[PDB]
Coordinates of C-alpha atoms and ligand atoms in Angstrom, one line a residue:
Chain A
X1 CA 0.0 0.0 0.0
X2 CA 2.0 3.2 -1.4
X3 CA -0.8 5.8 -1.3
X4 CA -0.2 8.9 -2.5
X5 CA -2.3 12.3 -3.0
X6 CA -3.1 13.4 -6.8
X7 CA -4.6 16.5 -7.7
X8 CA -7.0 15.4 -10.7
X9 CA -7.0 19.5 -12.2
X10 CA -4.8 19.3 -14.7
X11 CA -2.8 22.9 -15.6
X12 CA -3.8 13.8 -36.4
X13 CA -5.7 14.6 -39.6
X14 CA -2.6 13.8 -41.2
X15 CA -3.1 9.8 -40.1
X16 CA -6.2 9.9 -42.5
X17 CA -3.3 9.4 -45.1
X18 CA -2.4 6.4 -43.5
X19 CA -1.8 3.0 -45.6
X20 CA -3.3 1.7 -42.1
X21 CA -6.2 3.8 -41.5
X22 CA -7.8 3.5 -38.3
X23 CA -11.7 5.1 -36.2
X24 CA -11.8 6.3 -33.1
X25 CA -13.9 4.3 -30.9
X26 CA -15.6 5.7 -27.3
X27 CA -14.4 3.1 -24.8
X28 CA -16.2 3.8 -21.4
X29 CA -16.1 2.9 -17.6
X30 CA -17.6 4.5 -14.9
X31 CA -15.3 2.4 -12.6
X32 CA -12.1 3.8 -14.0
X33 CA -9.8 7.2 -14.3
X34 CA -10.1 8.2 -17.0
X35 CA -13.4 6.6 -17.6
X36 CA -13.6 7.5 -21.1
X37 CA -10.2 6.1 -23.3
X38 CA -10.3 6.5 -27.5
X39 CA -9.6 3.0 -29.0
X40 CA -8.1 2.7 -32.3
X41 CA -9.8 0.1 -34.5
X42 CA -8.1 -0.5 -37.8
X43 CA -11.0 0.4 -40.5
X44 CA -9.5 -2.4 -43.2
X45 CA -8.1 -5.8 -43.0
X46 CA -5.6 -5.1 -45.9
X47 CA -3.2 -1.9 -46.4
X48 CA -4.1 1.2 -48.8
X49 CA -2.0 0.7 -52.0
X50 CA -0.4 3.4 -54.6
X51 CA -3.7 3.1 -56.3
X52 CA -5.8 4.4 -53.5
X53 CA -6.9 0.6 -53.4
X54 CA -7.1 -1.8 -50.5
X55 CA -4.9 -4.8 -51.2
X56 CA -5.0 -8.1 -49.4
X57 CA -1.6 -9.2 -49.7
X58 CA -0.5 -7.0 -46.4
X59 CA -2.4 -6.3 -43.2
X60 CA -3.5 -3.8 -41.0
X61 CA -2.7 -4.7 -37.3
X62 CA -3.6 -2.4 -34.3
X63 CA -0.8 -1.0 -32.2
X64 CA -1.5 -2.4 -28.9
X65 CA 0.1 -0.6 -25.7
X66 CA -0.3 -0.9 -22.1
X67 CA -1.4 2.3 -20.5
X68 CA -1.9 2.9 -16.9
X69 CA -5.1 3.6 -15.1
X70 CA -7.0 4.3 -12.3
X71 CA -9.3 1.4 -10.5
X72 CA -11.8 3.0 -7.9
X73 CA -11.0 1.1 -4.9
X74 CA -13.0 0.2 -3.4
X75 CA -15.4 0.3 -5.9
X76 CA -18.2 3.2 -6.8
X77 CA -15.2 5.5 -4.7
X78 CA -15.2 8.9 -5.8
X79 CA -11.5 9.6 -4.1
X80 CA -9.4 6.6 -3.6
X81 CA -8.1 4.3 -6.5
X82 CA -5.6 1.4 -7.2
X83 CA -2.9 2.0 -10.3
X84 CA -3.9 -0.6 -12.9
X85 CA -2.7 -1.9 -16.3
X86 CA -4.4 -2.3 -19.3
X87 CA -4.1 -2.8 -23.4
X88 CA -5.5 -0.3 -25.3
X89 CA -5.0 0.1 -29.4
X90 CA -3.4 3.5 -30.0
X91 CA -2.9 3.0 -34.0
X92 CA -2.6 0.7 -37.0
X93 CA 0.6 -0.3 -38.8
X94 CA 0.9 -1.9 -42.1
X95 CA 2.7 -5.7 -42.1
X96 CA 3.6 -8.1 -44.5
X97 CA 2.6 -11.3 -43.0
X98 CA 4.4 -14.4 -42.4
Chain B
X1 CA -8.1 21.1 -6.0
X2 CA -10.0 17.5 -7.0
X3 CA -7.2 15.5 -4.4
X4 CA -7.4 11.6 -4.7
X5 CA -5.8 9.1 -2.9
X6 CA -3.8 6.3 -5.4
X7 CA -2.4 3.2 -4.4
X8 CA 0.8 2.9 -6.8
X9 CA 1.0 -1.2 -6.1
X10 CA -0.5 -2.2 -9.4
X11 CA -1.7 -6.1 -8.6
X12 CA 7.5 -8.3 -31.8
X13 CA 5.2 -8.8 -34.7
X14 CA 5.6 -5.1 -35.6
X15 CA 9.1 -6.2 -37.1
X16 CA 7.2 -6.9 -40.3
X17 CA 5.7 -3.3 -40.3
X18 CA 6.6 -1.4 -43.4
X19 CA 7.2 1.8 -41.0
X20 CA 8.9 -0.6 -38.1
X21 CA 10.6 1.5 -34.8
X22 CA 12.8 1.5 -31.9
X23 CA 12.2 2.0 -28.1
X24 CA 13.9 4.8 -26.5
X25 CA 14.0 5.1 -22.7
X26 CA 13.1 8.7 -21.8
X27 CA 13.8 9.1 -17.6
X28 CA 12.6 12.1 -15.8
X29 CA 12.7 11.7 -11.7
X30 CA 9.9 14.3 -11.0
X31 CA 7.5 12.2 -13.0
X32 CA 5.2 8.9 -11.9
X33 CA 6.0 6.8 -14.6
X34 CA 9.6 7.7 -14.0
X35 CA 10.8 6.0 -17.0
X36 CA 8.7 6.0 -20.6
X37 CA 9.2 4.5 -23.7
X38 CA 9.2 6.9 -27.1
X39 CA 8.6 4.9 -30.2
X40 CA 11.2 6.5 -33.2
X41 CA 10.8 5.5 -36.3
X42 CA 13.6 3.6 -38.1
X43 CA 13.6 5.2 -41.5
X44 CA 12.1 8.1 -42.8
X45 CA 10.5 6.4 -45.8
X46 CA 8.3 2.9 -45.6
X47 CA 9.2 -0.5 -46.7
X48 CA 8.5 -2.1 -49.6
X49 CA 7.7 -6.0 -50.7
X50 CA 10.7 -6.1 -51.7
X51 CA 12.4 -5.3 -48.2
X52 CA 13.8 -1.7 -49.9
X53 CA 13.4 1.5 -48.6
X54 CA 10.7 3.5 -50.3
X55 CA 10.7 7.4 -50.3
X56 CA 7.5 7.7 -52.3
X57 CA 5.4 7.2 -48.5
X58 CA 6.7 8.4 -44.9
X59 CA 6.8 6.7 -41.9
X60 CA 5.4 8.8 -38.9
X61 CA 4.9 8.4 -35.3
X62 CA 1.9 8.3 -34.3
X63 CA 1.7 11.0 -31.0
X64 CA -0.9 10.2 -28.6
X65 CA -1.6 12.7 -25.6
X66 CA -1.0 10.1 -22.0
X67 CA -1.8 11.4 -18.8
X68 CA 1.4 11.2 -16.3
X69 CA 2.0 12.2 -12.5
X70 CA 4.2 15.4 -12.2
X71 CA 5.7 15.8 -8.0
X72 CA 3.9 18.7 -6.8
X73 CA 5.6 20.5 -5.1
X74 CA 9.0 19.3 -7.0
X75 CA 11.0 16.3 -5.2
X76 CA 7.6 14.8 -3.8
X77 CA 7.5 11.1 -2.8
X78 CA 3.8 11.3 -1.9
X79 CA 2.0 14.0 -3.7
X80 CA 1.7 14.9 -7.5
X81 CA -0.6 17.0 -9.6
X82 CA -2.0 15.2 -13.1
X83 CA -0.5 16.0 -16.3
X84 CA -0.9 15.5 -20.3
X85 CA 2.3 15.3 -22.1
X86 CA 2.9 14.2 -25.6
X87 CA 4.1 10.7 -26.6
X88 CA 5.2 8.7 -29.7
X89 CA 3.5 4.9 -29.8
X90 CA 4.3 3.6 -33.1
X91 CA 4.9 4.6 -36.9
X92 CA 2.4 4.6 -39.0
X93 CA 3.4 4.7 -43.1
X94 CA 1.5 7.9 -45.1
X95 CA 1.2 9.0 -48.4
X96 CA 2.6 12.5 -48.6
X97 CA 0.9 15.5 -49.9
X98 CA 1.0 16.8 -53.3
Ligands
LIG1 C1 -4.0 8.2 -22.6 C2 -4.7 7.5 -21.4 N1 -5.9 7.1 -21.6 O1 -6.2 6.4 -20.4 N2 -5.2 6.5 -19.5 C3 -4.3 7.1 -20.1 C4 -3.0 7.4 -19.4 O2 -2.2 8.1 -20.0 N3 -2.8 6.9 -18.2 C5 -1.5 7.2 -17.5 C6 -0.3 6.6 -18.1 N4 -0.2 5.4 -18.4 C7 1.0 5.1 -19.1 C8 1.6 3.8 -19.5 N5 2.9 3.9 -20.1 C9 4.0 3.5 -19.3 O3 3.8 3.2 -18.1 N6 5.2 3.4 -19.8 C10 6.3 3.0 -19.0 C11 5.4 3.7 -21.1 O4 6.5 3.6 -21.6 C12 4.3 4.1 -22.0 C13 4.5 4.4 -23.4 C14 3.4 4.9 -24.2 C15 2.2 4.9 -23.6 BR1 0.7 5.4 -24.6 C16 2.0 4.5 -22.3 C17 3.0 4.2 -21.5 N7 1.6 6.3 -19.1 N8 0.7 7.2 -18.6 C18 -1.7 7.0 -16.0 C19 -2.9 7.7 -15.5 C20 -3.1 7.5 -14.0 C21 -1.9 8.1 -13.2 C22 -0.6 7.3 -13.7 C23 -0.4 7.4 -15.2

């Protein structure tokens, strides 16, 4: 048990031309901090070509990462919280599969 | 002043990306992550089928805004003030404009 005292008040058009185009999707939970994260979901299987085309024959793939968050502990708590790790997709990439 | 209480005790395939990057360690001891990770792109143009180097498309990092714990008042152990800083996740490859 390290607790410690936070003070909560704090003080990408270009990816459209992406070969690995990706939405943002809402993700929320009332039982975290912040309760609303923005999910990247890849909007194609394959990768934009020169042609403006989607081709098959390479894939998008979301950029998973681990991000830190805050659990309300115990739960519904409006002021005390428990540091938490989750994967959330920030982005898509463009691979050439195996 | 919205002060919480946080526990801290918490309880690659993108090789074959056509924009592939590195992991660089970026330390700063008034911050909670001390040390993050900055994705950097390994070339400044994507790869090809062919494994070559294509300056026709750019890779880019993809900058997402994270939420981080800055010591308030500096040299802290026990009380920080929330903060939004900028950082790189991944490259992304993008068809330049014309
Ligand atoms: C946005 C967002 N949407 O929802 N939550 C967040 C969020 O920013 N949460 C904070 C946070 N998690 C991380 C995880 N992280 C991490 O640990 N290392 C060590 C990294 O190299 C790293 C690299 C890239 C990314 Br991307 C993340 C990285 N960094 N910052 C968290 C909030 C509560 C107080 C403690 C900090």
């Amino acid at each position: 048990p390290r607790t410690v005292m936070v003070n909560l008040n704090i003080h990408s058009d270009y990816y459209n031309r992406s070969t690995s185009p990706w939405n943002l999707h809402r993700n929320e939970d009332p039982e975290r901090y912040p309760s609303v994260i923005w999910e990247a979901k890849c909007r194609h299987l394959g990768c934009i070509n020169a042609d403006g085309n989607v081709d098959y024959h390479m894939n998008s793939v979301p950029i998973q990462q681990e991000i830190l968050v805050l659990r309300r502990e115990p739960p519904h708590s409006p002021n005390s919280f428990r540091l938490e790790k989750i994967l959330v997709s920030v982005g898509c990439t463009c691979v050439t599969p195996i």
